[PDB]
Amino acid sequence: FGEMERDCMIAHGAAGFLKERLMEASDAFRVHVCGICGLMSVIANLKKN
């Protein structure tokens, strides 16, 4: 989904389609962050919640 395609999608203003087409139909991911330092160093253990 080359750049120019991104620009064409913007042109029509189809925001949500562009959002999902670059997250859901592609490399989505989840992370955790610390609200103090704002880094991505949180040590998360889900089964240990």
Next chain:
Amino acid sequence: EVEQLLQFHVATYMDNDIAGQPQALQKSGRPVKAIRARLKGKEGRLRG
């Protein structure tokens, strides 16, 4: 000389396209892949 060598590897591992200086290489002879090289270019992260 040793500390300059250490500075050199550190700089290369941080960027391997410094002007006016030779370029670090693998034993294959191919120039190394510094992080800056990774990010820049069409193939880089931003445009790739």
Next chain:
Amino acid sequence: LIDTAVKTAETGYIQRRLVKALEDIMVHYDGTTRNSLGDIIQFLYGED
């Protein structure tokens, strides 16, 4: 043939530069035309 081959690349480059220049201009509800920062370019899109 050579002319077409050369011209296509330069036109594509110009297209890319233009798009990456004006990709954030958006016609706001007030009728103004502002880029990302909110700076105003035209007080009424196309003056009409």
Next chain:
Amino acid sequence: ELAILKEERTTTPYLTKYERARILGTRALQISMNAPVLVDIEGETDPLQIAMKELSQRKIPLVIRRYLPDGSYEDWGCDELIVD
């Protein structure tokens, strides 16, 4: 503070195409996943057709929140927007 009182709402009263699409998508998504239907249905099974049918009657419980460039915002009910 950020909200604008109903009397001085200045934006265009009509419904922009983008608002139209967003509203249709949201309503169809809601209906298509076990939500109440505010209007009768005769034979149409598609959620999105149901969504446009609902809109044509002006029976949508959605309030559009329009953000002005400064940051202030005003809110319009879908019931009060003139749809072309």
Next chain:
RNA sequence: UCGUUGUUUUUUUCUG
């Protein structure tokens, strides 16, 4: 017994 994974790196000649 659901499950179940398959390289990079360059260079090349091509297609619109």
Next chain:
DNA sequence: GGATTACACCCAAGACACCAGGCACGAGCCAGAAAAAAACAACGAAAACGG
């Protein structure tokens, strides 16, 4: 005309503009396809051989 108050002025010193070369970067369209190729020099062990 020596003495006496009055000043002419200028020239080295110092601050600054700038300067045209050089010197570097640093960029130079899009998507797609296939086949074809990809480090090694020396070293001391350790099986090797005839002594």
